[PDB]
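CORE FACILITY INTAKE
Project code: CF-77B
Contact: R.S. (postdoc)
Sample description: multi-component assembly, five entities in total
Requested service: structural model of the whole complex
Turnaround: standard
Below are the sequence entries exactly as provided by the requester. Do not edit them.
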Amino acid sequence: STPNVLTNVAVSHSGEVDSLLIEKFNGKVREQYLKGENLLSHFQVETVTGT
Amino acid sequence: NTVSNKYLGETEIQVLAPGQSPAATPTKADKNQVVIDTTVIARNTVAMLHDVQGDIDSLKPKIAVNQAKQLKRLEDEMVVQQLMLGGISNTKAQRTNPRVPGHGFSINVNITADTAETSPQYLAAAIEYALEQQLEQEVDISDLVILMPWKFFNALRDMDRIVDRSYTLADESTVQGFALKSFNVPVVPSNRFPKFSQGAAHHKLSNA
Amino acid sequence: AEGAIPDRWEAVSVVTTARNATTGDPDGTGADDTVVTKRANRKVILTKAV
Amino acid sequence: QGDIDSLKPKIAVNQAKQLKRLEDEMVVQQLMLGGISNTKAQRTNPRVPGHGFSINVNITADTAETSPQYLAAAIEYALEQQLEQEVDISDLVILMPWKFFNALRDMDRIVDRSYTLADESTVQGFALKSFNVPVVPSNRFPKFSQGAAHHKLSNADNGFRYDTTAPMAGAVAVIFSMDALLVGRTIELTGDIFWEKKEKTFYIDTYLAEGAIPDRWEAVSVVTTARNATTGDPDGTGADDTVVTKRANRKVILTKAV
Amino acid sequence: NTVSNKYLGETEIQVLAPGQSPAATPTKADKNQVVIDTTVIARNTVAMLHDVQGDIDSLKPKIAVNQAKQLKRLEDEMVVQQLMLGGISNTKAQRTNPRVPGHGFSINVNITADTAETSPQYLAAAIEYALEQQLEQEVDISDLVILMPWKFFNALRDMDRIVDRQGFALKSFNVPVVPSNRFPKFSQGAAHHKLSNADNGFRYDTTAPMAGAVAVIFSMDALLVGRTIELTGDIFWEKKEKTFYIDTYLAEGAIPDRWEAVSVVTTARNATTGDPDGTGADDTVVTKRANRKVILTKAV
């Protein structure tokens, strides 16, 4: 009256591994923020060429 | 049954002399994963004879709605508890090294309980401390959300600065939630919040 | 069925009262208190009693 | 086998941010050195017999965080010392670290609308009402280490000026004008990606060339905390703690009690 | 850089009474996998002055097409060596029950060093015995292919087994026969295959029993092979040193997969060297089969 022995593809009879799933990536990576102060804007750069 | 993510690190800069190729610098990387292994259900049975002679009207949809509300409360409780644990567990005192050389740590602010209940200024100072320490580690605060239980949500509200109209940081209607004005961050009060007892109930989603 | 896990440590920051290890009753004096109670006293009107 | 979607543009944009951060940090460090080096006590003689020196005011580090009136008095004192040297104070800008920025903005006089010297929105950075100079927050202030190597851009021709020393370990609130520094650029920030045939590699590089030196001697004025020469950690009482804590009691109300 | 196969089990049948509702039957799904880590590159150098003064026309494409053939030969040798290791290391002796209990395990047979080439009957009986012990496991005879060197092909030729059909085939159990020279050597002193590292357990390296195999039988899905880079050749001139740098690379890997469709008929070999002097463990049976094929030959 019950399905006592469920077939399961997520278990390894031989062992040596806990599971068999694929570990998908989902396509998301994170990095540091570092807002740009842009503090040099107050000053004149005074480009130099030649000398 | 799992979902992963990857984090990248820093890159180093160095001086060059003219006419040479400088050596490179490595960049580290790491990963984080989540597993899903447990499901929860709620079931009820109604006999045909007991249904046909029933004083309550439309019993079945009412039971379904109640079940939906219970299962909706469970996920909110779980989410709040999980992010609560995540805040505590990663605090520069336990981890002491970031996942990559670049990123920073979560900040936990620990204060005495008795004084926190008595004075609202104490809680406002603690929250401002946490927010500015967030700001120090290059974290933008334009989009942040604060959750408080009703007991302390009432507490933060009663400080004179927020209540008084003369002061800059004041809001008119604060029963439904207000925006802190020292840092423009909304505050949302949530009833659901973890509670502890001596007995171990062993939350269902927990596994070995 | 649903699951969750903390990630992106910089995103979440929590303020927690000091609590006894064995029981939920509060007995500790706090570990971050001194960093605080110095930030509490700035938010006050200041008077010079004569 | 990277498994990463883009990798290379991400590394390039990370390198660009690194270079921009160092470029800003170097400017802040040079402003601090220009403030601290020539303060009428060490120079004892102006660069030209006419002009005047920069002003450095020193305050205790411990009492700085406890009371905002202390920092407000220090800033007002620095501005007053600047103005006594008959320099216009209209085009001045103040930089403050976040921790001390919150201290300065937490004052009752600033928040209270009734007081005439109050500003409403301060999160982006408020404007000082007593002196119309604006104040902005920054996180690029230099940090000191005991055994750190020489900072890049520093060479044994310009006296190793670029790298930091102990006295500015925890300085706050640099005050500067437009003509307070003399910067120059040789090569603008340019990023390049190479694909080397000989060695099967992808090269990602970015190079830049800046320079700076403090010259005006008057447009820069810095307030700094007293700190041990040997180590970064603060100790002792600021040299100018005597004048301050008397100016800190100006902004009070009497409130006699019967 | 990992490739998985995702095996699957075999179900079981059972009788049902009216209203019995029988229970169930489970499956395994072992899912072995392979990893590829190293690349193989062949490069040649041509000077600018010699290129301008070169007698041959279109020398660089010729060098490139030669390098491609060299890489192909290395590829084939590695495939054969791995397929041989799969047959050697996967008999019932070591594993003692197969993964995915439905499928089964691969078969190996041993031959004494002498009389392997002296008597064609011995070798023919051994090959047929290995082939039938394979075919007892539902191998779908049409798929499988025999691969065996020229020296032993000549010995098998003497018996009428090999007939044309432009591949060759046995009389009974008609299957294609491909003779090849790509077989393990075991020089006893060669450093490494150059495709073996510490992490992979030093595969691709010809062990002592591997040398001298008379034949090997394989089906289609007998190996798992991974390719991250297909072989490409690019001729490029660099300004600094005036050179052409043909520079071709391969970057592949492989592993035994099916565990059941590989049969190997290696002869007995002496350990740590050549000079077999081996009696052969699986001999007592095969010789009895070798004497099976005789002619009555009544005298006049």
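Facility notes:
- The helical segments of chain B are 48-52, 59-89, 113-118, 120-136, 150-157, 160-163.
- Chain B is about 35% helix and 15% strand.
Invoice: internal transfer
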